[PDB]
Each structure stands twice: as structure tokens, then as C-alpha cells.
Amino acid sequence: MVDAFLGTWKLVDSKNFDDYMKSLGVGFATRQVASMTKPTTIIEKNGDILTLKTHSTFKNTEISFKLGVEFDETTADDRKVKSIVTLDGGKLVHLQKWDGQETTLVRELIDGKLILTLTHGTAVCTRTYEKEA
Numbered sequence: 001m002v003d004a005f006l007g008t009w010k011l012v013d014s015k016n017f018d019d020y021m022k023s024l025g026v027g028f029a030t031r032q033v034a035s036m037t038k039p040t041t042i043i044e045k046n047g048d049i050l051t052l053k054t055h056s057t058f059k060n061t062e063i064s065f066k067l068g069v070e071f072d073e074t075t076a077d078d079r080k081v082k083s084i085v086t087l088d089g090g091k092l093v094h095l096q097k098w099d100g101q102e103t104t105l106v107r108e109l110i111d112g113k114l115i116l117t118l119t120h121g122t123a124v125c126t127r128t129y130e131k132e133a
């Protein structure tokens with residue numbers, strides 16, 4: 001049911017995002033900007049290439065990848081990371097590694113909503129998204 005992730009998703013709730021960003025070394029001025037927008041995330045597929053786009057006023061980003069194939073990514077906060085996206089049951093797991101550390105960005109569909117859990121050590125952030133019509 002990978003296809004249930006496809007489409008356009010809008011942020012409707014957040015918890016611990018500011019704490020998560022602080023845990024990655026994102027400065028207060030940038031955290032303030034990042035938190036005061038409700039981003040849109042577009043997930044699309046073309047053959048075996050997936051694309052994830054994030055649109056806001058903090059930044060626009062786009063990554064393209066194949067499931068299970070490591071890729072280079074430069075995150076919204078300017079980390080150069082080694083990334084991989086996998087499917088673990090119903091969880092779409094985006095792992096970012098750099099400099100001996102890591103963070104996961106996990107997406108799961110619960111009751112039709114897309115729950116994005118961001119984990120960096122003990123910092124855990126929940127970002128709740130609703131599908132656009």
C-alpha cells in the first residue's frame with residue numbers, strides 16, 4: 001500500500017519540532033522562521049523513482065530516490081547527509097547519516113492522516129499532515 005503515501009499533504013499539527021531543530025544545531029532565528037509556516041509535502045512516483053517535495057516560506061526542497069538505494073542529500077538546514085528511504089511494514093523511513101550521527105524521518109498513515117515522526121537521539125517530534133483533495 002506504498003501508493004497511499006502518494007499525493008499532496010498539508011501540516012495540521014506539530015509537537016516538539018522546535019526541540020528537534022535545536023537538537024540538530026538549528027539556530028533560534030531559523031527555528032522561528034521554520035515553525036511559523038505550515039508546509040506542504042508532495043510525494044510522487046515515476047517508475048521506481050520517488051520524489052518528495054516540501055514547499056513553504058522557510059525553504060523549498062526536493063529529493064528523488066529509489067527505495068533502498070543510498071543517495072546524497074542537502075537538508076533544508078544545510079546538513080550534507082547520506083540518506084536512504086525504506087519501507088518497513090507500513091512505515092516509510094527516511095534515514096539521514098552524517099558525522100557519526102543520524103536522524104530518522106518516519107511517515108505512517110493512521111486514520112487517513114500522515115504522521116511524520118522525526119527522531120534525533122532523545123528528541124522526538126510529531127508532525128501531523130492531512131491529505132489535500
Ligand SMILES: CC(C)Cc1ccc([C@H](C)C(=O)O)cc1
Nearest residue numbers: 021024026034039054076077127
Ligand atoms: C531541521 C529541519 C529544518 C529539517 C526538516 C524536518 C522536517 C520537515 C517536515 C517536512 C516538516 O517541516 O514537517 C522539514 C525539514
